[PDB]
Amino acid sequence: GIGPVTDLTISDGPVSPDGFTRQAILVNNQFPSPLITGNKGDRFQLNVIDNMNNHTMLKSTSIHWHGFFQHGTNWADGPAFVNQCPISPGHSFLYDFQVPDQAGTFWYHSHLSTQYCDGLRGPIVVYDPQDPHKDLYDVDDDSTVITLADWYHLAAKVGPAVPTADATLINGLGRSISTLNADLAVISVTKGKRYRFRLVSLSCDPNHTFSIDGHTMTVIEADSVNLKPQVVDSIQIFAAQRYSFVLNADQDIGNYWIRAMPNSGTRNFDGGVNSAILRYDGADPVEPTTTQTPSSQPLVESALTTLEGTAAPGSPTAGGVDLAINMAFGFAGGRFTINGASFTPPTVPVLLQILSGAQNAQDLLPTGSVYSLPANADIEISLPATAAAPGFPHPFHLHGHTFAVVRSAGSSTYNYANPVYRDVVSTGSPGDNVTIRFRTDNPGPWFLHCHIDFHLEAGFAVVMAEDIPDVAAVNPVPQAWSDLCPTYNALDPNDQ
Ligand SMILES: *[C@@H]1O[C@H](CO)[C@@H](O[C@@H]2O[C@H](CO)[C@@H](O[C@@H]3O[C@H](CO[C@H]4O[C@H](CO)[C@@H](O)[C@H](O[C@H]5O[C@H](CO)[C@@H](O)[C@H](O)[C@@H]5O)[C@@H]4O)[C@@H](O)[C@H](O[C@H]4O[C@H](CO)[C@@H](O)[C@H](O)[C@@H]4O)[C@@H]3O)[C@H](O)[C@H]2NC(C)=O)[C@H](O)[C@H]1NC(C)=O
Ligand SMILES: *[C@@H]1O[C@H](CO)[C@@H](O[C@@H]2O[C@H](CO)[C@@H](O[C@@H]3O[C@H](CO)[C@@H](O)[C@H](O)[C@@H]3O)[C@H](O)[C@H]2NC(C)=O)[C@H](O)[C@H]1NC(C)=O
Ligand SMILES: [Cu+2]
Ligand SMILES: [Cu+2]
Ligand SMILES: [Cu+2]
């Protein structure tokens, strides 16, 4: 793919991924946005050149590199008004960071408002030259990335505040009910080879239930964390999650349906909606006629475990940490709340408030939304599901960290000995109490929020202000970052 040192030039233009033409956001003249690649420990230098001129889809921008810890580079994490002011139209801004001790499947997306829904979102793969799962497969390359995305015929700021998708795109292609002849994505395999497929959800809202007719999948990585291998025949993947799975192309040469059923919008496969094609070399270039078997081995999150057997942080007892926090979800005045507070973006980004002299979390804006975390501590956060926060199940993402999921959705058990670790978790449905743990090893303000982007826009977020006293020393900011807020604040409102 491109990188790890490359320009990413952002513009507006026409696209037609499901056969319907609409204006959207291009990256290096491409929709969908291009794959970025590098190797474990590389320095990424991603020069984002903002040439957008359409205020309806926002002229300004900021990009989050989803899943990277950003230790010492908190200013590069991406959330607008938490870690930076937006890049302004006609300006460039260099994200310059390293990725020590991570390897797996990631993605990048606009982290300003609901802009990524309008098309600024693509996959990232960070390869490991000693990947512990390499001997399970033969092929892992640009052609084995599989992206899932929601797509809307009206733009994010033009349609309903919580819209309903017209199409699921698989690798940027798919059909809507009015475009049943649109080109489907084709994923090529050769009989007798084994493939590491890297499944990335670029979704703004729906989750997808993914399966491939006639084949099983051996899951080996979740949200960039290596797992013990687990055979499944379907994966429910929530917005912003990733999984690697190995597919053994050991069936008859032919065409097989790839299925990605969303939880909303059109949910069937009639006319080949919500679908793509797995094509064996030597097959007729036509659509599959395969039929779906019910899933008998669906992925179950509580059954996943890390490859390295990593325990949860802290003691193997409820509340056996340094600081435990419960997040009570609600809704008031058309906005989401967490512990009674709705996040509204501040005028001065939270990181710049710290760097300008705010000495504790109580001094930070917005008041009610910011949590102090002590350094070198074990933290436990519970996120009990409730119908009081509409549009559940809500998949929450913690920036700056991987976390142990000690209790998953749909499970009553707590696992401290060998839970899965990941960075986006469904908080499930009423009766659940999804509980996560992490260690504070990364000074800076980090967002924690639902990754349904329309819910984030309606305030469903808090900020974890981790080790405020060390933030300036550990995160020296570059000159170009210091210039973002004065440039942004000088813009006319219609040029934002
Ligand atoms: C910035 O980004 C936003 C968000 O993506 C863009 O917003 C879009 O706005 C339009 C205008 O309100 C929305 O309405 C629909 O527009 C489409 C597309 O129209 C274009 O292509 C047509 C060819 O198929 C063409 O005829 C159009 O040209 C006419 O309009 C322009 C502008 O007014 C004018 O200058 C020309 O002289 C022409 O008169 C245009 O180039 C259009 O197809 C839709 O029509 C359908 O629906 C209406 C009823 O709603 C009906 O009247 C029609 O018969 C038909 O069924 C409709 O007008 C559009 O939905 C928005 N898009 C999204 C994704 O939300 C915005 O345009 C961007 N700005 C720029 C400058 O690109
Ligand atoms: C989801 O799980 C969390 C974490 O277990 C639950 O919150 C915890 O609930 C118990 C009360 O049932 C609290 O214990 C009590 O603490 C008080 C004050 O310290 C003490 O005086 C009592 O004797 C009792 O031990 C606990 O503090 C609370 N934890 C936190 C961090 O807030 C939560 O209720 C669960 N929610 C659902 C819907 O299941
Ligand atoms: Cu993300
Ligand atoms: Cu949500
Ligand atoms: Cu975020």
Q: Are residues 98 and 161 in the same domain?
A: no
Question: How many whole angstroms from 63 Cα to the centroid of ligand 5?
Answer: 10
Instruction: Give the C-alpha separation, 376 to 442, whole Å.
Output: 9
Nearest CA to 109 among 141, 73, 80, 75?
Answer: 80
Q: Are residues 34 and 91 in the same domain?
A: yes
Residue 318 C-alpha from the chain's centroid: 28
Q: Are residues 282 and 338 in the same domain?
A: no
Nearest CA to 220 among 203, 244, 251, 236?
Answer: 244
Q: Are residues 237 and 171 in the same domain?
A: yes
* 401 labelled catalytic: no
Q: Which of 71, 133, 208, 451 is catalytic?
A: 451
Sequence-distant (6+) residues with CB within 8 A of 133 are 196, 220, 221, 226, 229, 244, 246, 307
Which of 250, 279, 308 is where one domain is finished? 308
CATH number of the structural domain spanning residue 203: 2.60.40.420
Q: Is the CB of 324 under 6 A from ligand 2?
A: yes
By residue range, what is the domain housing residue 64? 1-132
Instruction: Give the C-alpha separation, 381 to 434, whole Å.
Output: 9
The method recorded for this entry reads X-ray
Q: Are residues 97 and 170 in the same domain?
A: no
Which of 274, 293, 308 is where one domain is finished? 308
Give the three-state DSSP class for 464.
strand
Question: How many whole angstroms from 317 Cα to the centroid of ligand 2?
Answer: 13
Angstrom resolution of this structure: 1.6
Q: Are residues 86 and 62 in the same domain?
A: yes
Total domains in the chain come to 3
Q: Is the CB of 384 under 6 A from ligand 2?
A: yes
Q: Is the CB of 433 under 6 A from ligand 2?
A: yes
Question: How many whole angstroms from 421 Cα to the centroid of ligand 3?
Answer: 16
Nearest CA to 450 among 468, 434, 467?
Answer: 434
Q: Are residues 288 and 216 in the same domain?
A: yes
Q: Candidates 382, 408, 435: which one to mutate for ligand 2, based on the most atoms within 8 Å of Cβ?
A: 382
Instruction: Give the C-alpha separation, 457 to 112, whole Å.
Output: 9
Alpha helices in 68-160 (DSSP H): none
* 111 labelled catalytic: yes
Nearest CA to 216 among 233, 197, 196?
Answer: 233
Q: Which of 401, 449, 454, 468 is catalytic?
A: 449
Q: Are residues 301 and 335 in the same domain?
A: no
Residue nearest to atom 42 of ligand 1 (CA): 22
Which of 92, 115, 132 is where one domain is finished? 132
Q: Is the CB of 158 under 6 A from ligand 1?
A: yes
Q: Are residues 394 and 444 in the same domain?
A: yes
Q: Are residues 118 and 192 in the same domain?
A: no
N residues, the chain: 496
Q: Are residues 260 and 337 in the same domain?
A: no
Question: How many whole angstroms from 374 Cα to the centroid of ligand 3?
Answer: 25
Q: Are residues 179 and 322 in the same domain?
A: no
Q: Is-contact 72 472, C-beta < 8 A? A: no
